[PDB]
């Protein structure tokens, strides 16, 4: 029965933050966790197999599918979630060893928030830069291994585009929210 | 042995509600949880593969299956369950931080109930708006990529239509029940 | 170390029942749980794929397999188990909130037992009504989408028919047992 | 920290048995549990798909595979393990409620041991009766739906026959051991 | 909070052994556990499907693959690990009941070590006897069901042969180590 | 409630190390753990099936895919992670038995760090030696079983090459960090 120590760990790690905002921050974050855990994994379960093209030349389908999608979608969001969760883990380990060492901080928090914002905005910007957020069923290709160009048909364009709509919205509110955190810190400081 | 604190958390979070109704509320909610966890996931496990059409033109089958089902079914109910569970998580985190802060409310509950009702009724209304709740084995299509129209055959129409019958009924009783909650609050207030 | 409270919860929830019978009631119930968890799920893992018919017309195989089996078997027993487990969950939550409220019943139990019996007997009766409990490898069909009739061959008729033999027997003993409970209550009352 | 109560539960449930033998009884039983959990499940993972016959008539392969194997192997051993574990669960629940009721036996144990022996010997006898314990790669068939007879080839005859050798040996030692238990009881009594 | 009892269980069960050696014994054993849990299972996941031969006669491929590999590889190592873990389980249960009975040994340990060594050396010897530890991509066959002989190609010979190199080395160091245990016991005794 | 003992275990095992560095050491290590657990396993889930070559001669595709990739990628990194985690397990077991034995060190730590560095640098060097870190979609082959040479097309070259970019960077920072540990020890000593 020593859950008081971890409760006080949480109290200290989240003491110097906004009164209301961390609530829905954690809520939306676990909202990601659950959706990414179930929905998108089920959605791109057989995506690679589902993709095919009307040509019969061996190799062209693969290279065109590679060019038309250099990055798999689930891959980008899981990297995003993990990499944005990294600073949280860093700071919690930091405070862990802190309370351990005075058993015998603010500017770190600022830096953590700032890099979180930078990583999120950079991932969003590069996603927009490569392919934006809109997508057609039929795709053209331009590759040496096969002549001219092959129209290739996507598996489930509508469902995944609606998904990226939700994900863009939640990314936007996350950006709003960490800007709010930065403003609160800047106003107190 | 500090389960008394969480018991009193539950006592406080559910103190200002109906005497009888939360019982079968939680029962039907976990009833969803279990059915969605096992049954529908097993049901639409190979739905995309199961769908096929009598034509042989590459691309038409995919676009027609997309148009005839812009949204996968499991997808709609999992989004529903998660999104309706969101306000519960919000309010429990809220009261968590509350008891934490007076360790050193009603109108929120009203708002939570109201938005829960709004989300549920909106999801039901849009589901009816798109395709209602009745479904045939043979489906027509109307798309540019392939000529005329292709009859396409559904995998297991009867089992899933019976499933949506149960799900419509449980949605209706859920609506009944949160209207009852609203009436109880409105009569006390 | 507060397992005494839950022990006394179980004591109170099962106090007004038969001396001997709940033992093998719970035993047979978990017996279901385990068998349904492993055996039947493994048995109907690839049933839909395994089914095929000697005709080549697209659509007829699917509609004939739908008509010949409007309900998948695992589906009926999992719905049965869940739906019969519902009243147990209801009553345990009920007594939970009870002991919680006098921290500051018999006729409910009768009603729970009665509806359990009604649901079990109704599920058994409708299963018999649709297809009984006997089954052949070769099945006829009668549907508009394809001419005349197609003999269709079942995947593993013998193993699943032996399974439904066991399941019918266990359903019968369950019926015996809740009738015994009802008789005990009726004799005490 | 109330593991003393369950320790004393185990002490009482196993008090009136052999000094040495229950040790390797439980060891061999969990030995089953692990082997059945991993090995045989991996072994018959794709058995149904692996089976095929040199004929091309639709239906004959299925009915011949059904006749040549009316029961799947994993199915028989999982039913065996579960059904032999049933009396153990019965008796442990029995003693549970016992110590609960004098909180306010030997002949049962004899009956449990006897039925365990009967079930084990009956399962072994019926397995021998149907197909014994020896098995060839090539199998003949005799069924109306297809003419004459089709040689059908088994997937992995050697590995599974070696497995049934181990399983027969462990069944034999289990029989030895419960006969030893019966002899000890008969000599004390 | 009664982990002291299990700590003292471990103290007693491992008291009469080598000072340094059990450390890396347990380390290498869990090293097996993890590698076998992930790597080899992923490696032979689709081995049976991957194997094929250039002939088209039904049955010959299966019987030749059976003869060329009478035992699947994962199967041999999982049997090895389980069967070598058996004496450990026996002895721990033994000492369990011991401390339980004086709550109201060395020669057993010697026997356990000796049989562990015997089982390990016997498994290694029989593995060498059947096919040694070296393996070619192309394999000949000699079976009645198909004429002459068929060259058959292995799926991933290099990766699995490197794996058996590691496994042979770890088996050798395990043999070294239990011989060291035997020498320590023989020198003390 | 005896988590103080394990806390003091961690305190002692990590007492003689760098003040800041172990934090992000553990962070990046679990970062591996998670990425390897989800991403790469999903990435090479169907790699072997995805690979194919434009020739039709049985056997050549397999041997060419073997030569062009003697080692599967996931296989190398999982062996890396496990084998580098081995010294950590060794040293923690060592200190476990230590505190156990004075219940009735530095140079070991140096050796552990040194071998960790050696294993990491050796794995990186051999990976570079075999195939470096750059990779093309089209691969040539040179094998006796099939004439001349076959161009073979890789499944997803871009995504996995970007992955190995991240993995090379994290390996480099790991090398930096254990060199920092070695420098700190060398300067204190």
Author numbering:
A (entry chain C), B (entry chain B), C (entry chain A), D (entry chain E), E (entry chain D), F (entry chain F): 2 to 105, 151 to 235
Q: What do the study authors state?
A:
Gap junction channels (GJCs) mediate intercellular communication by connecting two neighbouring cells and enabling direct exchange of ions and small molecules. Like all connexin homologues, Cx43 monomers assemble into hexameric hemichannels (HCs), also known as connexons. HCs that reach the plasma membrane of one cell may interact with their counterparts on the neighbouring cell, forming GJCs, typically organized into hexagonal arrays at the intercellular interface. GJCs formed by Cx43 are crucial for a wide range of physiological processes, from propagation of heart action potentials to maintenance of neuro-glial syncytium and skin wound healing.
To ascertain that the conformation of Cx43 GJC is not induced by the detergent present in the sample, for example through detergent binding at specific sites on the protein surface, we removed the detergent and reconstituted the protein into MSP2N2 nanodiscs, using 1-palmitoyl-2-oleoyl-glycero-3-phosphocholine (POPC) as a mimic for the native lipid environment. The 2D classes of the MSP2N2-reconstituted Cx43 showed features consistent with a mixture of GJCs and HC. Processing of the corresponding particles resulted in 3D reconstructions of the Cx43 GJC at 2.95 Å resolution and HC in nanodiscs at 3.98 Å resolution. Although the differences between the HC in nanodisc and the GJC are more pronounced, the conformation of the cytosolic region and the NTD is highly conserved. Although the two Cx43 GJC structures (in detergent micelles and in nanodiscs) are almost identical, the Cx43 HC shows a notable difference in the ECL1–2 conformation. The resolution of the HC reconstruction does not allow us to make definitive statements about the orientations of individual side chains, but it is clear that both loops engaging in junction formation move inward upon docking of the two HCs. This conformational change likely involves intra- and intermolecular cooperativity. Despite not knowing the precise identity of the lipid-N, we performed nine MD simulations of the Cx43 HC with a DHEA molecule as a lipid-N surrogate bound between the adjacent chains, to understand whether the channel is closed in the presence of the lipid molecule. As expected, even when applying high transmembrane voltage the ion density for both species, K+ and Cl−, in the NTD region remained zero and no permeation events were observed. Hence, the presence of the bound lipid-N molecule seals the channel by rigidifying the NTD domains.
